Amino acid sequence: HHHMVELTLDPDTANPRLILSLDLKSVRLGQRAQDLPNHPRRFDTNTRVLASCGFSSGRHHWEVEVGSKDGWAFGVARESVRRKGLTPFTPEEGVWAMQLNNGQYWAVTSPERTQLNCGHLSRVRVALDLEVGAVSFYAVEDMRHLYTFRVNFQERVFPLFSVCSTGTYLRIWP
């Protein structure tokens, strides 16, 4: 029994175009925006949602089931990640993520992304280590390493999820 943190998507953060599953574990992009209460924590233009739980210390694992189609990115964000207006999806903006775009897997480095030659992903294990300052990604099938960002995190870190195209999704386990 691998001990993973119990995460729920934070509806107060979700872009209004996102459709969250009724268990708040899954996210996809809808065809149209919902009328949601204006909230300071809400991503009003970028297609993002955070978990309701953030981390200041220790080691935390969770898993993300990923769609086969382009349009998703996920990882962690610093709490101060900007919510309002169009923002860059980059480490400078406090986003540390992997992405599926044009049939290829990427670590979202800046100013150019880093192609991962990892083969098809069904489910990814995220290993957040706030003792050492790292976030690592593994393919669950054989636990092959995908990517590690090494960050001297200076604030609370939140699980981050983005879906910018219809026809794909992300789902938190457990």
Binding site: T45, N46, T47, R48, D70, G71, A73, L86, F89, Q99, N101, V108, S162, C164, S165
Partner: peptide, 12 residues
Amino acid sequence: DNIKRKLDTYLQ
């Protein structure tokens, strides 16, 4: 439409 697809990924 690649225009919407490129414009889509700017919203990530």
